């Protein structure tokens, strides 16, 4: 079964400057700004763009060791990034995949908005405990504010 999740938040960073850092160069930043959450983001197969398979390795002590994601779309113009979690972590018998779309839109006051949609494809008709959803919301908040804090500490970075 498919179970749909949505969440919206804001950042003080402009949409373009945030998309360049939080999405395009997120492989570099996430182990650098939030090492307590992500140890490394290995790019197993691909050219960054669609079809790419990243290996996000986690520090030992977190509930999961790693996950492997697949890049589905990188919209450099409208600031969209749809990717799918396909292996590792919560994925297995009771969950097929987690498809995620992140869009960043600019706000008039110079900031930005993050629309975050989660699409959980459960095998059969199993439920999804909030612990997995709560872990994803906390993970998104942690990485967003870490890159945000990095972009505030270095006003030069990413133009």
């Amino acid at each position, epitope marked *: 079964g498919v179970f749909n999740y949505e969440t919206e938040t804001t950042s003080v960073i402009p949409a373009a400057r945030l998309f360049k850092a939080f999405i395009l160069d997120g492989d570099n930043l996430f182990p650098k700004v939030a090492p307590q959450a992500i140890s490394s983001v290995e790019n197993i197969e691909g050219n960054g763009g669609p079809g790419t398979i990243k290996k996000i390795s986690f520090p030992e002590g977190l509930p999961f060791k790693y996950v492997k994601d697949r890049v589905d779309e990188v919209d450099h113009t409208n600031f969209k990034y749809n990717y799918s979690v396909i292996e590792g972590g919560p994925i297995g018998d009771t969950l097929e995949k987690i498809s995620n779309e992140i869009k960043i839109v600019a706000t008039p006051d110079g900031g930005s908005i993050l629309k975050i949609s989660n699409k959980y494809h459960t095998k059969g008709d199993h439920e999804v405990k909030a612990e997995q959803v709560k872990a994803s919301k906390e993970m998104g908040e*942690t990485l967003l*504010r870490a890159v945000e804090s990095y972009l505030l*500490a270095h006003s030069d970075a990413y133009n």
Partner: antibody
Amino acid sequence: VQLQESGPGLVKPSETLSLTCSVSGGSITNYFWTWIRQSPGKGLEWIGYIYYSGGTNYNPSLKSRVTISIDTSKNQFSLNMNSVTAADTAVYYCAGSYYYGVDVWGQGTTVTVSS
Amino acid sequence: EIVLTQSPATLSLSPGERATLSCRASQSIKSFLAWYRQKPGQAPRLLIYDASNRPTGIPARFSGSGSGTDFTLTINSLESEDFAVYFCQQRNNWPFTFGPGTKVDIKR
């Protein structure tokens, strides 16, 4: 950016420590708002830190009895440590942290746990 | 939690000499070490972040280096105003943890 502690300097054992820190000279968005204490026995100790989005992160040795809250409208954040004992007597620093470390600090307020 | 060890506890140097402080971590903190100075009666001030980089306003006479488990802070041309206790901090794994501190006393 400016931070000022305000809270009781004397807390009786098993009661609740409560501290508040006022942010001025800068937006509530800038830092990871942080609580750090310093005691002779334990040295410098990370209590926890809160984003302006509400996401907290607590030290496991103190997560059992520590809650950190933020009120972005009043430009304030708070620390609440209940069931305090003499092992909680320390100078408490409210502070603002970047991703790389604590960038700005409060003056520090001395809390004594005593009967 | 990752346990940071600082060596030595106390060193006593004349002004103008080079001060070399050491920090050791029970596990690998890749490059995520910070150095703070705490002059008496004051809140600590960050000097080195991510083990070699220097925040804006910290003079060039402070530098850090190291990776893995062994890092060192170096103060070129000590001043009498450099009398303080210097702590190292890892941010690799929560909880972030400090070292016991190295006190730099100024010879006179």
